[PDB]
Amino acid sequence: TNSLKQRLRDGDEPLYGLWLSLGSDSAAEALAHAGYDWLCIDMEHAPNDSRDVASQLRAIAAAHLPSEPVVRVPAREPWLVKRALDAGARTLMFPCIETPDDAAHAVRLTRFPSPESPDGLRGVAGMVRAAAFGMRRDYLQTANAQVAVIVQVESARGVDEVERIAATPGVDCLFVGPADLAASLGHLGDIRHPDVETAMARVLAAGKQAGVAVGIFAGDTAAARQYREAGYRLITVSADVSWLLRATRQALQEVRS
Amino acid sequence: TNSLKQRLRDGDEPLYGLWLSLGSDSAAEALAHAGYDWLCIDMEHAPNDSRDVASQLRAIAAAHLPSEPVVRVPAREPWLVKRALDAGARTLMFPCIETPDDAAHAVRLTRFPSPESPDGLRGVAGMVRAAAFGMRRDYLQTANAQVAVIVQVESARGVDEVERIAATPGVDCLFVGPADLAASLGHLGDIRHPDVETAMARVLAAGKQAGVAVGIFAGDTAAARQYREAGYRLITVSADVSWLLRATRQALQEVRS
Amino acid sequence: LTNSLKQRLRDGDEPLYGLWLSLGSDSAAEALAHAGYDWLCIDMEHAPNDSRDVASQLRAIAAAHLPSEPVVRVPAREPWLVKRALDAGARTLMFPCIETPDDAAHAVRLTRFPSPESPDGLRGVAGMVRAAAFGMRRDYLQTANAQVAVIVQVESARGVDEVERIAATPGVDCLFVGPADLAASLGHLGDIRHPDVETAMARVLAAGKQAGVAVGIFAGDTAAARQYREAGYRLITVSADVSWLLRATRQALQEVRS
Amino acid sequence: LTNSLKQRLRDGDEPLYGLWLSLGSDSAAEALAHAGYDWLCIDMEHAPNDSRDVASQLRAIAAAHLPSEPVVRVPAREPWLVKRALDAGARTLMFPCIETPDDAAHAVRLTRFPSPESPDGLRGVAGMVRAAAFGMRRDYLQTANAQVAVIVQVESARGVDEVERIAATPGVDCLFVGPADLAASLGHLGDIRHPDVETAMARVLAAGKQAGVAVGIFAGDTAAARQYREAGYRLITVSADVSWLLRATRQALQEVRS
Amino acid sequence: LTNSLKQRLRDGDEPLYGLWLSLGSDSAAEALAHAGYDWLCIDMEHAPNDSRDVASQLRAIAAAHLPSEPVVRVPAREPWLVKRALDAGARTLMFPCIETPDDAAHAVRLTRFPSPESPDGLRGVAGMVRAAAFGMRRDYLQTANAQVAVIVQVESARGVDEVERIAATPGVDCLFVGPADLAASLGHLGDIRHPDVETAMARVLAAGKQAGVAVGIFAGDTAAARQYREAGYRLITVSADVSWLLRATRQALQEVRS
Amino acid sequence: LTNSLKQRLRDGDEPLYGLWLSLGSDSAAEALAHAGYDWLCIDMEHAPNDSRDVASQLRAIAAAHLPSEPVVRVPAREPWLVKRALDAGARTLMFPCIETPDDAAHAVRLTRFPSPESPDGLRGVAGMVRAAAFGMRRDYLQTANAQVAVIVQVESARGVDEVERIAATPGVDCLFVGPADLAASLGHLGDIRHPDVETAMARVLAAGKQAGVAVGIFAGDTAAARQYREAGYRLITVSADVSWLLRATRQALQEVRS
């Protein structure tokens, strides 16, 4: 029972996340006590390889609390997706989804072939972490239903195709990364440029009209509340390293003042 | 001398192996004492990256016993095959081999360009582990003769094309993973389904006809024995973690009965 | 919240079955957390498990969300090593080489915060460690002592002579026999069935029974484990991960070849 | 080149603000090296940092090329552990559980090459280690002793009783109060504001003022750190990395939800 | 702290001497940072250096506070791998097997943020990575591109044939010859002195001179390195860490035994 | 099955040349296993090698399948540290800081299982450790002692004063001189050629010869190693991995720039 997937598909309340960039088992376990709905282990812009991902998923699970792990893969390469699923990640985020075919392919990589999903490309291996090392031979009958797919729309081409992307069966969430979108649209460093705001609004309306959840990365709490008020549901409230630096610098300023 | 390569070519005797899924140096070393003809460090469905492969190869080698290491690479990407070979793996298994072009390419990646292999794609670097850090002077002239290539046939297309794949120069062994093949054929988790069994029978017959050893992954000793009687040669007797779990759970129920 | 291994050791009469973890592997620990054992022992004395390895194996076992209770055997009775294991969240500790009731009492002190029930406690206070949920268990200090269990390994001839007084040491929750080291210290290296070794072991078990303190033992095989169960040992180790791995893989090879 | 923490501890009157590093993270260490603190503490006592973690965290802090001075709290006053910290390039060491002037003097000796100014120095020579730039720092044997700072933690009743004599030990550069352990040791586990604890902490602070030795303290929050600064403490820890991370993220979640 | 390798590559005739780092060792890397080389290459293609190793070796070199410029050879021109190396702080990248001007242009684009100076840039943005001082370098997006340098390896017949156009690609700071790979590719495996190979090499060198683009090369020994310096190559690798280690320890044994 | 270093130390007259491994690198260890040395020292005292690093480097050396014998210098004479090094499969141990014949005997005891041959052995028993081929060596306990060798380091005035009695201690296979630590301890830091230091060294060397015990020494260069061989030292270290790496790479640079 992938509860994050259930809430994305069947809820209307926001789901608050933290980005995990530090690659620290202790930081992941500590933050599994922070009360967030989800936590993202980034492989794309943080140096988390397969063993780091399995270690951090273990550290989160060890807290025995409700936060759902998400893994952002570095790319839509079959072997990389295979590693994250085998490690036990049940919600994956794919960067640079530009076309409906990119999105369909991402979804196929997460699906065991079934009548449910005819053309699936997910590989079978019964001794991996995800199959409790062989102790759930029932694994293969349920897994397809519990794997969530989040696609990142971060380019002009992807925004133009976003309605087709959102209509792809198996796309559970569209995710907006404002800084990459802004750069890609010719507006490096300026996420509130009207071209960028127009593109983000279009992703949000497309999700709403397709009945597909929309997520977004927020750099701070003020922006996160704006995105909530606007209708985004999967809201990242910035990142571990960013909070660590803000908080320790603020404390120092206070003592010195 | 790669003795697994030599016995795959000249022998009729079966060659028994064990799958190493745990990623543990200690388990690899211990199991190097177990009497197996070969041991497989899996990079596809276990989280073994280049340093993990080098550490397990050292751990097996440290035992000073006859077990031949096999490395299954995550995918047919040049850079990955390059890492495996440089680390000193001399018998490589390729997943997802579907066409004779795929098989030819796998072989090309493992060969330095020579008159015997004019289209070899293996990159030259003299200081790597495989060259004893520069101490094996004649490394470039002796390497190609000691590399073995095992191609895994795991799709309907691979099975369709299996006669052409087996005829490919350089292919030392055809490897059947019944679980993957059953998924691919629309019988997820049902390796006993008769279309699965016909597909496996066809790969085996292809090998006998080509004079190419056939390998297979067995989940239990009964199946391993069936395969041996059928003519499979390179037989995996399940996986480290599967034996570890069976034996510890059986011992517990014996004690407590 | 509750160390169920401690509670069962002190309150129950039933056997508690364990497996020794020597391989130092997170995946192996997580896999074995599905094997049904009452406890699993991460060994720091005779396996190369240092503090980060202990924490990573604890996490790996906890991640299975199943009932096995981890036990840590520390390398030696040094304050800094005991601190490392407790801070990492191990709540049941095994101490090697306990030979006198002073040794046993010291081992206990090292596991206790100074408090009314343990005024001589020597455990160092740090609120941000893994054992305190990184600061989130705000009453960690007031509630930790009650959940820490101490197992003393009795494995020498002096220890056997002192075993009734070791058993009566407050805070000793289990007496553990390692027959291999016991046989070696009594002059019978490699011979755990020498009658003098069997006599020593019988004494330790009897001391436990008379004191109402659980006795444990490392069994090298299943026949042994059953003999020990029948004799009244409670905390019974059914050999070790690496031993089962070798035995089962070697057995499978023979079967396939026969 | 110059240990500026030692320099300012000896020569200056200003507070020197620090942060505890308990996460054991290279990236967290490098990031925090950009935060403006005077010092950063890699804890080996109450966090799982062994020798290679200390080296990699030292390297991470150094790679920022900024003023923060690393401090390493050793697990215990054992010669081999002190050696590991010094060889890795830690130039300011903190020693837990210092209770007697002899304990203090021993800690100092472990950090000193035997030399005219330190005839009983016990630091071991090994010219190939990181601290000696692998042999490239040719004046290392002449320059090292003067750049090593020794901080002694006073955190027991006995230590407080001897604090004036500890403070007078040559080579003691700072007396550091851990209020949590000191409170426990005085029978007030969990209550650092009890009057008996306050009196003990004030005695440590007076002892340093009187000896001309800087005094340090661990603060749980900024209001307490400011009270300490006003009282005359100089080496003031502004809580821990993990503490700030948890507080910040939890406060952020409530803001977003409210 | 400007990229001085890019600066010196863009200008003048001076040789720039380097060492290949294959051992994958933080300690070796920091030690070699003291050896006086202009640059040091962390190889990901033919040594087992993954993202965390690259970051750890970059930290280790940085910790020495000395002038050597790190270079990272990526395993392939796959966007995710290039992203990893840039986010880890690598400012000079070497790309293997560049064969066409389109390959070279693509390699360059992967390293640049999209900006007025580079409107076709494809480098992706993440503000919290090590290259951005984890968000503390406020002007990073506007200053990064100017300090990133690109070395393209020419090691195939096809690359040789296109070399003048590769050289003309904006953003190619250096054409690097690997003779071993080139010789293999030209059907002369193991024989870098065959005249077909020397011709090919001479052509790459003439192309760079004519264009004012620095040419680099791997030398296996000092005789070779000198021959290449005299011929006009600027970015000269003086063999590899492991090769010098083996050579020196083997010759020292011979001297002590003779 | 034969510790050839132990046999040659006890029965040979030939020199036994070694190399100090301080880099902590598996690849460097395996490469150096090809360089032709009699012995290779994995240092745990003055390099950051903990138990897993020792096992990794032992594997890496063994993987070469060549004749070099590994030696491990333990950090200290502590039962748990010795257990870790022996259990890992090290068969020759060097102990630092041996000052008295009681020290030396204790060290020997720590390496021996209690057998008829060594009834006072203190080595704790474990049958499934790497040294026991994970339990495949079913007579490991009964046969391990005969292949375990002990090297004691003499590095203080007290040790030199007691060197005749140390050398007479059963089970001491080699007296090892570290000139740098000896010099420091005798009041001559950095001055290994002072007459006091040369006089002490001569006495250690004479004591070994008289007793029929091999004498070892650490040499910083080949000319010193040659002098020591001429004086009658047998177990001769030809400096360290990192020192050769730096000398060789720096020499290469000099030769290319000249």
Interchain contact F257–E (C-beta under 8 A): yes
Residue among E46, E106, E188, E194 flagged as catalytic = E46
Q: Return the residue of A nearest to E130 by Cα.
A: A46
| Sign of the dihedral defined by the CA atoms of residues D100, D104, D110, D114, in that order | negative
Interchain contact D41–A (C-beta under 8 A): no
Cα A130 from chain centroid?
18
All residues of chain F having their beta carbon less than 8 Å from the beta carbon of residue E236 are 256
CA distance F134 to B59: 13
Q: At what angle do helices B221-230 and C241-257 cross, to 10 degrees?
A: 30
Tokens of F219: 């040499």
Mutate to test the interface with D, among A228, A240, A255 (most CBs of D within 10 A): A255
Give the one of D31, D60, D133 whose C-beta lies nearest to E59's C-beta.
Answer: D60
- Across chain A, where does the E strand assignment appear? 15-20, 38-42, 68-72, 91-94, 148-153, 173-176, 213-218, 234-239
Q: Exposure pattern of D132-170 as b/e (b: 16+ CB <10 Å)?
A: bbbbbeeebbeebbeebbbbbbbbbeebbebbbebbebe
| Resolution reading in Å | 2.0
Nearest to F3 by CA among F42, F38, F34: F38
CA distance B174 to F5: 47
Do F238 and E252 meet the contact criterion of CB atoms below 8 Å apart? yes
Which residues touch F202 (CB under 8 Å, ≥6 apart)? none
- Is C181 in Cβ contact with F80 (below 8 Å)? no
Tokens of C139: 């009453």
User: How many domains is chain C built from?
Assistant: 1
Cα E19 from chain centroid?
10
Interchain contact D245–A (C-beta under 8 A): yes
Alpha-carbon dihedral F158, F163, F168, F171, rounded to 10 degrees: 80
**Alpha-carbon gap: D234 to the closest alpha carbon of chain A (Å):** 12
| Sign of the dihedral defined by the CA atoms of residues F179, F185, F190, F193, in that order | negative
Tokens of F131: 């040294």
CA distance A184 to A177: 11
Interchain contact D138–F (C-beta under 8 A): no
Q: How was this structure determined?
A: X-ray
Q: Return the residue of C nearest to A26 by Cα.
A: C130
Interchain contact A205–E (C-beta under 8 A): no
**Alpha-carbon gap: B135 to the closest alpha carbon of chain C (Å):** 32
**Alpha-carbon gap: C58 to the closest alpha carbon of chain D (Å):** 14
- Is F134 in Cβ contact with B29 (below 8 Å)? yes
Q: Which amino acid is at C96?
A: P
All residues of chain D having their beta carbon less than 8 Å from the beta carbon of residue E87 are none
**What CATH number is attached to the domain comprising D249?**
3.20.20.60
Backbone phi, psi, residue B91, to 5°: -130, 115
CA distance E240 to D219: 49
DSSP tally for chain A: helices H, then strands E: 12, 8
Tokens 């440089």, residue?
A: B86
Chain A with chain B: Cβ pairs closer than 8 A? 75
Which residues touch E6 (CB under 8 Å, ≥6 apart)? E91, E92, E147, E148, E149, E173
Do A91 and A146 meet the contact criterion of CB atoms below 8 Å apart? no
All residues of chain E having their beta carbon less than 8 Å from the beta carbon of residue A47 are 51-52, 55, 84, 87-88
Give the one of C222, C241, C257 whose C-beta lies nearest to B244's C-beta.
Answer: C241
**Alpha-carbon gap: C173 to the closest alpha carbon of chain B (Å):** 23
Q: Is C194 a catalytic residue?
A: no
CA distance A214 to A234: 6
Q: How far is CA B111 from CA B10, B108, B121, B134, E136, in A?
A: 21, 5, 6, 19, 48
In terms of residues, how long is chain C? 258
Nearest to B192 by CA among B219, B156, B161: B219
Which residues touch E109 (CB under 8 Å, ≥6 apart)? E118, E120, E121, E122
CA distance E50 to B50: 8
Tokens of D186: 């005085």
Q: Exposure pattern of C169-182 as b/e (b: 16+ CB <10 Å)?
A: bebbbbbbbbbbbb
Interchain contact E185–B (C-beta under 8 A): yes
Parallel/antiparallel/unpaired status of strands E149-154 and E92-95: parallel
3-state secondary structure chain C: CCCHHHHHHHHCCCCEEEEEECCCCHHHHHHHCCCCCCEEEEECCCCCCCHHHHHHHHHHHHHCCCCCEEEEECCCCCHHHHHHHHHCCCCEEEECCCCCHHHHHHHHHHCCCCCCCCCCCCCCCCCCCHHHHHHCCCCHHHHCHHHCEEEEEECCHHHHHCHHHHHCCCCCCEEEECHHHHHHHCCCCCCCCCHHHHHHHHHHHHHHHHHCCEEEEEECCHHHHHHHHHHCCCEEEEEEHHHHHHHHHHHHHHHHHC
Chains near F (3 or more Cβ pairs under 8 Å): B, C, D, E
Interchain contact C64–B (C-beta under 8 A): no
Structural domain harbouring D32: 1-258
CA distance A104 to A111: 11
All residues of chain C having their beta carbon less than 8 Å from the beta carbon of residue A55 are 26, 56, 59
User: With 0-12 CB in 10 A as exposed, 13-18 as middle and 19+ as buried, what is D182?
Assistant: buried
Mutate to test the interface with F, among C20, C22, C25, C186 (most CBs of F within 10 A): C22
| Sign of the dihedral defined by the CA atoms of residues E41, E43, E44, E50, in that order | negative
Interchain contact D141–F (C-beta under 8 A): yes
**Alpha-carbon gap: B181 to the closest alpha carbon of chain A (Å):** 9
- Is F58 in Cβ contact with B25 (below 8 Å)? no
- Is A135 in Cβ contact with C55 (below 8 Å)? no
Nearest to A56 by CA among A69, A47, A44: A69
